[PDB]
Nucleic acid binder design. Structure first.
Ligand SMILES: [Zn+2]
Ligand SMILES: [Zn+2]
Ligand SMILES: [Zn+2]
Ligand SMILES: [Zn+2]
Lengths: 519, 522
RNA sequence: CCGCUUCACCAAAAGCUGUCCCUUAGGGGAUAGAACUUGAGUGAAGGUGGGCUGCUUGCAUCAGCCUAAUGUCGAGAAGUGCUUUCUUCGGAAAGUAACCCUCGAAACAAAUUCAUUUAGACGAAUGAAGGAAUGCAACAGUUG
């Protein structure tokens, strides 16, 4: 099962109507061009670099040109009068808010009525069959006769059946969590197996076209003063449907910043469109980020069974020591990296050193009579307990690396060899931690943890890492470690590739290189 | 006309009687005399409170290296003797399990009454319910249920007043918010008794320079069924009028007497002093638990009080304004007398940055840090440091608010003008929102500054907030060039007018706009 | 050690200027200048550099105490997941114990009990009942 977040700029009614939209958008754009001959000098971005005569590019957010490209609902209303089946952005966003508040009201009121029905009249003793009877006989009919698409009512039946828990609240340990109606989409479920193909998603220019079936939604004569939204009907699909199709824009915003694309999900959407990857859920709500809380995205939810893979020796991992981290892990194929935390061990050594230097100043003439026997008594118990802490921390690190590789499904990791490891000046060790460390138990515990998950070890031990780039083995021999402390450990810039890289990840990439062999 | 407040104080012990308390006070005096003549000057640590009355020694100590005060401490076998001697007397363990049962039952009845009233308003009533219907259904359901379980009327009227002050009807009418429901066991019992004119409330008695409150209560009895599923439901709570047993508590004040402000008229010690002196009749009594300290939680107590407003020289002809700054957190601006206030002395954030580094290194990889023992323990260090940092933040905010109020009383402004909240979250010239991503809650800050200016009768006017960082203040010349990235790339300079050459602090302009009275409110 | 503080000295990847291109939505790359700044750089000094209790809280100091504590564990089985059995729509029951599964566990000091090798000290406890600093600054709170 998965949840996949895509965006929408506009509906897609037909071909020629959105053609007319683009054409008259460009027509107002060229009217803004030919009118602004030093009437404004903001030089909207794009508009200046394409064909214009303006002075200064301003940041493309408060300039006059895109407001002209921002179309008007007078023109949209005249378009609606030529073509009544050409619906637009405000119409679909009103329908979004209307269905969202509809489902939120029906959901919350049916929850509280179920809770009351079970626990105060019937005294808390019934079955879940009565819950399903309330579902089918009350809220299925309510959502199917408030809007005549019964599949949405079945999806709400599924949603409330998941969201209402009888046996939890039987002990009254908590309460029913209610929303502020900004956290609530609409189900729009179809069948999983075969017959209901699912939302008829097609391809477009690096983007998609959805098809969501509906009815007629006659705009009512009485637009209610108390109720600012409910004026539609959403008539029967079995009598007279009219499926709304929308343009699914693939722009994923990165935390209120510009337009970006993430491509770990586009292949999954293509797998939906070929015929496999049988999704059944289109959640329609706002985004959870800044300024996407007003623009309506879409959420495709999918289900796949647990198809296990295991590990394979084609994937070849690497484990290297770090300078900010005590260790790092790297895979030669994908990005797929992993740091190891430092701060807990750092604060622990800080407290241990502070305790030691406290005890080494309030003892020097204070505990008399014994000599340095009972002066040395409390530091030893500290050191056994510190050693047990270091052992448990190393076991936690080994289990973390094992979980990392098992999620990444790596068959074998090439781990850098031990005597070569300890004789390294670039490590996090031998800089602050001088030499006081049990390296061999760490290696043996890592190997035992990995072989518990069944992953072999290689001992490849190259001649010179930490300055050879993974893209091209230039052997950038100006990376002296003295130079690195002289530049306070800067990035690794492979100058022949113009390859600026986090300075230790490439060192971990050299250990994952399978072309060099073991020892 | 009046401003509400609460006072949080700690319960020391259940004050029992006059005779039994005379017995225990004389027993403390007896132990003091016994260890007075037991020590034939094997001691030189007579504490300061003892050198005046019994001094055969050398020096003074810090009132914890004493022995006579240590002799005043009472054991627990003598309390078992007092348990056997007086079965009518009350003691901590019984009162604590009473209050735990009361917290559990009050939370359950509060949840059941909230969903009951939501049902009888919106489901069966089809949403057809004005506010008078809601009060009618409050009195119809919640008071009847609470008097059906608790034979007290005080707890019943308290639950009705608490649910009335919690069921915010208009937001759940137009679907604007979420239905409340509690989760925590730290749920305070409301305890309302009225106070208007021919009634007083709870009988505050200053017996011997201390504080004794008197909660009316019935004669509880021991249960018979003790089910294994729910342990704490183990009492009966019989009727006040058939069998009154007033639980009377003692609240600590010895720490408050040693403050700088105790012989004054404005610090909260003077409100406690007037509560001792008859007036400031309380009405609303919360019984919380404090920090979990040493296997036995110290139950706090909250005392409502309707203080009259301090006059303190108010004349709303004078007008001042405040902002959010970039060098100071808050800057205050006087319209005409050219007076400015700022606060630019604290080292608070390396502290909150070490905790946030610790939270992030716990949070982002929680998978093996402390697993196998629930999620209440898995976030246990985080909860202690978040509560302590929010307490530090609230106390710094209240110190800021008192400095602001002292400034405005020093410059005699009768009414202050403050920004709209919907703009304050979206105001990126702030000293906040650039150092801090999602940390600070500003609604509580504004509530504290609103209350602290209300404490001198200075009113707070919501204003038109639009583009205040660039509109000038000496003359309204509308210098709309002073953009955000323009401000960053000029190294955060002075704002200067295009034609006044008004080179002054930009945030000080951003409040001297609001300090000019010509802005209409909203 | 210190990604602790102060002082002094020192280096510039990160920030600015300026240049140039590419879409210029997000911004991406390099070359010369300065130190506001930075530094997990150097030297002198001191300093829990984590907490707990001290009677509502915070900072600083002080008295005593805990710390492997960002740790490690105790008990369970309300819930999540998983196995088996049934109606086979949909859930139940038995477990299992992996779980952002549930409840918990360190911290002033008098005094008391029981026990320990020989009145000293340790252990297990006991557990509220004004036994507790100084100085500044405040001190409506819950719920949503
Ligand atoms: Zn523009
Ligand atoms: Zn390379
Ligand atoms: Zn004394
Ligand atoms: Zn101006």
């Amino acid at each position: 099962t998965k949840t996949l977040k895509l965006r929408i700029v506009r509906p897609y009614n037909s071909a020629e109507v959105e053609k007319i939209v683009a054409d008259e958008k460009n027509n107002r754009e060229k009217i803004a061009l030919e009118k602004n001959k030093d009437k404004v000098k903001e030089a909207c971005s794009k508009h200046l670099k394409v064909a214009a005569y303006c002075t200064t590019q301003v940041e493309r957010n408060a300039c006059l040109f895109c407001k002209a490209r921002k179309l008007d609902d007078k023109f949209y209303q005249k378009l609606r009068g030529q073509f009544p089946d050409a619906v637009f952005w405000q119409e679909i966003s009103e329908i979004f808010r209307q269905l969202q508040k509809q489902a939120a009201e029906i959901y919350n009121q049916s929850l509280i009525e179920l809770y009351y029905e079970i626990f105060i009249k019937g005294k808390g003793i019934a079955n879940a069959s009565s819950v399903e009877h309330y579902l089918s006989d009350v809220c299925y009919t309510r959502a199917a006769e408030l809007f005549k698409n019964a599949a949405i009512a079945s999806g709400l039946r599924s949603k409330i059946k998941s969201n209402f828990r009888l046996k939890e609240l039987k002990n009254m340990k908590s309460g029913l969590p209610t929303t502020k109606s900004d956290n609530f989409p609409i189900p729009l479920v179809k069948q999983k197996g075969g017959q209901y193909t699912g939302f008829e998603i097609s391809n477009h220019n690096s983007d998609f076209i959805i098809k969501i079936p509906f009815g007629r939604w006659q705009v009512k004569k009485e637009i209610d003063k108390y109720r600012p939204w409910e004026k539609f009907d959403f008539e029967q699909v079995q009598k007279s449907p009219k499926p709304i199709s929308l343009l699914l824009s693939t722009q994923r915003r990165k935390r209120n910043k510009g337009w970006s694309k993430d491509e770990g999900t586009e292949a999954e959407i293509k797998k939906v469109m070929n015929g496999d990857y049988q999704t059944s859920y289109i959640e329609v709500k706002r985004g959870s980020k800044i300024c996407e809380k007003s623009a309506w995205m879409l959420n495709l939810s999918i289900d796949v069974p647990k198809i296990d893979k295991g590990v394979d020796p084609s994937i070849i991992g690497g484990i290297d020591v770090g300078v900010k981290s005590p260790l790092v892990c790297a895979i030669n194929n994908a990005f797929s990296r992993y740091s190891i935390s430092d701060n807990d061990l750092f604060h622990f050594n800080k407290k241990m050193f502070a305790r030691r230097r406290i005890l080494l100043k309030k003892n020097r003439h204070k505990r008399a009579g014994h000599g340095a026997k009972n002066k040395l008594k409390p530091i030893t118990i500290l050191t056994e307990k510190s050693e047990r802490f270091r052992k448990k921390l190393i076991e936690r690190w080994a289990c973390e690396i094992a979980d990392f590789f098992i999620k990444n499904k790596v068959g074998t990791v090439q781990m850098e060899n031990l005597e070569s490891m300890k004789r390294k000046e670039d490590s996090y060790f031998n800089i602050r931690l001088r030499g006081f460390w049990p390296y061999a138990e760490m290696q043996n515990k890592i190997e035992f943890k990995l072989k518990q998950y069944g992953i072999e070890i290689r001992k490849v031990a190259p001649n010179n890492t930490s300055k050879t780039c993974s893209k091209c083995g230039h052997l950038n021999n100006y990376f002296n470690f003295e130079y690195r402390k002289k530049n306070k450990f800067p990035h690794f810039k492979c100058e022949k590739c113009n390859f600026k890289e986090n300075a230790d990840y490439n060192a971990a990439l050299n250990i994952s290189n399978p072309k060099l062999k073991s020892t």
